[PDB]
Amino acid sequence: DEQPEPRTRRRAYLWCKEFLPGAWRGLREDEFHISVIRGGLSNMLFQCSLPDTTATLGDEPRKVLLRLYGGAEAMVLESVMFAILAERSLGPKLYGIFPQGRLEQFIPSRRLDTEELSLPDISAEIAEKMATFHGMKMPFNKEPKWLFGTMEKYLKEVLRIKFTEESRIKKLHKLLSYNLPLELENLRSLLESTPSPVVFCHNDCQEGNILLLEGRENSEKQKLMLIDFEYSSYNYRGFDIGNHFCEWMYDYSYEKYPFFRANIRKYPTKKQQLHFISSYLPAFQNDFENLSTEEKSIIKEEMLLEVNRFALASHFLWGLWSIVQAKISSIEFGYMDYAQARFDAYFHQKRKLGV
Ligand SMILES: CN(C)c1cc[n+](Cc2ccc(CCCCc3ccc(C[n+]4ccc(N5CCCC5)cc4)cc3)cc2)cc1
């Protein structure tokens, strides 16, 4: 039970006392319980709780999550999004919002590991949860400018990076030797000919953003929750699914430099992809199962091509993102090696597709 700084404990006490009802309003500071869940310099997480000897007065929570962020448009959109998903029972409830952070429902859980993404019941539920997410109507721009707008933005940053450390200079020269402007436009041309509906996408469906709900671990359905919606946007459906498939290949729990492992052989097989989309489609279009077997087959075959082509944009986007992080991040991760891993997978997948 790691304790926060006294000033943070004091601030958290005050946010809980003023934003939460019932027993919280009369809580004494010396009976306030708080422990650090996740540290860092940004989006620190804390668990805040009543003492076990304090009875609740009504329906107020006994335990909450405090998220501390530490532009203004980004704050408005993210806060509105989180509030809406909470109303719709698709994210944790929202108890309080303030300039420094927010108070959220505490969901007893652990995150999934990379290997668990391939378990058939897990994969089927992720597909169902993603299809549900993709049905959200949200009050945000519905033009799918996000994917290539972000890749163009990152590419312009990357081309101008001036590293001073020798290994980063050398690794950057290799990544730029591919002629990334031209490759990005070849990717744009391919995806422009690849139909994919524009839906509200999570854009980051990795194992670290999927909760395994405590006490549901042996239940066949409804044991997961997708969280961490910060990067969500209207986007091509194929990206959300392809990006999720790419995440089967990357384990971020490796405790040595470069602090990830990559395994191209862990990408879902076409059998595993069919299992996923066979759960996705009836969750996204609930009379899907009443179609003929041949019409379902066509839809599934076309989706396989769609998602594996958009998986290329997952590699390209995250590869560029990682180079940018190598320049600007304050965190110990092997960003340049991860970039090379994503571009290696980009070209490997390009070959398999024949493009
Ligand atoms: C949609 N999109 C463009 C993004 C979506 C979300 N982010 C947040 C996002 C922000 C920051 C990071 C770096 C975190 C550094 C601290 C930290 C270090 C290691 C680990 C274990 N770990 C290591 C690497 C890791 N990665 C995710 C793929 C990139 C690699 C995850 C977990 C976890 C945390 C990663 C993702 C950024 C971009």
Numbering used by the authors: 80 to 149, 173 to 457
Sentences from the paper on this structure:
The synthesis is initiated by phosphorylation of Cho and Etn to render phosphocholine (PCho) and phosphoethanolamine (PEtn) by choline kinase (CK) and ethanolamine kinase (EK) respectively. In humans, CK is encoded by two genes, which express three isoforms CKα1, CKα2 and CKβ. An overexpression of the α-isoform of CK has been identified as an oncogene that mediates human cell transformation. As with many of the kinases that initiate the Kennedy pathway, the HsCKα1 is able to phosphorylate both Cho and Etn12.
Only crystals of HsCKα1 in complex with compound BR25 were obtained that enabled us to solve the structure and unambiguously interpret the electron density maps. As expected, the crystal structure shows that BR25 is located within the known Cho-binding site. Strikingly the compound favors the unusual conformation also found for BR33 in which a new adjacent binding site is formed that is located at the back of the Cho-binding site. Whereas compounds adopting the typical binding mode contain a short and rigid linker consisting of a biphenyl group, BR25 and BR33 have the flexible linker 1,4-biphenylbutane, explaining why the latter compounds adopt the unusual binding mode in which the aperture of an adjacent binding site is induced. Compound BR25, in contrast to compound BR23, induces local conformational changes of several amino acids, allowing the 4-(dimethylamino)pyridinium fragment to access the adjacent binding site. This is mainly evidenced by W420 in which a dramatic conformational change occurs. The rest of BR25 is located in the Cho-binding site. The two positively charged fragments of BR25 forces the molecule to adopt a twisted conformation to maximize their interactions with the enzyme. While the 4-(dimethylamino)pyridinium fragment is characterized by a parallel π-cation interaction with Y333 and W420, respectively, the 4-pyrrolidinopyridinium fragment is tethered by Y354, W420, F435 and Y440.
